[model samples]
Target: THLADHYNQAWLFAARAHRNQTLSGSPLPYLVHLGMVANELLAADRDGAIERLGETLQIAVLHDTLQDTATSPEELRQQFGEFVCAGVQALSKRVGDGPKRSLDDYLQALAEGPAQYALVKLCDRITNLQPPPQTWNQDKIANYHQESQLILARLGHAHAATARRLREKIEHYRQYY
Candidate 1:
């Protein structure tokens, strides 16, 4: 029941947060990407044989709060509890001056923390691998692939089961977007 509630609430939050956004460059609604990210979480659960269902659902829903919405960690903690909020903080990106750390940085942070965070990162990476539905320059494409491969490698070391499943999905989804 909690998983179901969180999943529904996540969909609601994503709908509002991404209301005006689009893909990197496409006609698709931003919510589509959010759904993809959620799908990745659901897939990882099946692939990882996850046991704690509600927590995974909660993090999956709140993963983008820091990146998209204005919600703060304290707010998330007050609403969702520490584990979910910590998972979000672990995976959240901070505004920086230098080139932004790619999703790999997100994975690295997850590494230093609990195993649950890895589950959220795994789903985020898998979502990224989906067809961009937009065109990109060669350098962009190369970087995407390289970063994705690096994620697979590092994540495999951190969470072998989830990483294997994520890598396979990435490879299969590569030719599509």
Candidate 2:
């Protein structure tokens, strides 16, 4: 699809891609997660921490499409551009073989990418850290907690304001642990 009003276009595309999908252990539509990430970026923009919401917002709206939906990276590059496509590519986990290798490769690639990639990941994790899924055991919750710390350590300095908010969210999730 040709780019026209990219933010809205991305939202509609993501909505269509994730249609009928809901968050794990919750009835909340999957789009809510995308919206939350967009809101996080807006708040960051308002806080004067991150500028240039144009591509960033679009990336936020379509962040999970690659991993969770049938949307392809070539489609993103064709529709959006290289920067946004590459940004999302960096956020997506690579499934080369085992889960351990996948997470390690994804994190390593992300840690070396642009700050915008980290921003998307940090904002996404902020929403995810709200509360552990009801079905998640303590071990699962702990994994998320430790994962957040690793994200913070890797990207916290990219945007201090967002890092601080993420830290608070991570701590808030601890009560459930």
Candidate 3:
């Protein structure tokens, strides 16, 4: 079956929101990252590992809007509903305060939220475990790999298939460091 209309709308919104941005160190459009996350969720859904497929897909596409773009929470809430807006919000890393929350703190909060939040996060990280950016030194690369491990440990239970895929990516990513 095809995805619901709302998913496509969210894709368009995300595409517009990130139009000017490219992947961290590549000329490829930022939409490629979003599309990979959405694709991961779809594959998980096909395997029956996803419970809230439609909402998860919408969140998958819009996950980076609040953090990476000028898009506001109000804009998300206006376009999508409270659930999507809130899910996207949770996926965004928190800002402000003397010291930012540790990666563990963020993942712990996500682990406590609805399962979909963790699932989207897992998909996002799985996509991110790709080749390191040219600008990253060995230390940065190792830290990112460690972060992926923390993500797997905290959120892996949300969906076994996604977790397994993430594990594979994480292992493959080790070549860089």
Per-model TM-score, in order, reads 0.81, 0.88, 0.90
Error of 3 at 80 (Å): 1.1
lDDT of 1 by residue, 62-132 (tens): 77677766677787788778887787777777622334556657667777777767766777787777655
> What's the distance in Å from true for residue 18, model 1?
2.9
Better of 1 and 2 by lDDT: 2
Residue 31, model 3: lDDT of 96
Determine the C-alpha RMSD for candidate 3 after optimal superposition of all C-alphas. Answer: 2.3
What TM-score does model 2 achieve against the real structure?
0.88
Candidate 2: where is the Cα deviation over 4 Å? 1-4, 49-51, 95-101
Q: Evaluated with lDDT, which candidate comes out highest?
A: 3
Better structure of 1 and 3 per lDDT: 3
- Off by more than 4 A, model 1: 95-105, 157-161, 173-177
Across 46-134, the per-residue lDDT of candidate 2 in tens digits comes to 66556456888888888878777878888999988898888877876742332433666777777787787888888888988876667
Which 10-residue window of candidate 2 scores lowest in summed lDDT?
94-103
**TM-score of predicted model 1?**
0.81
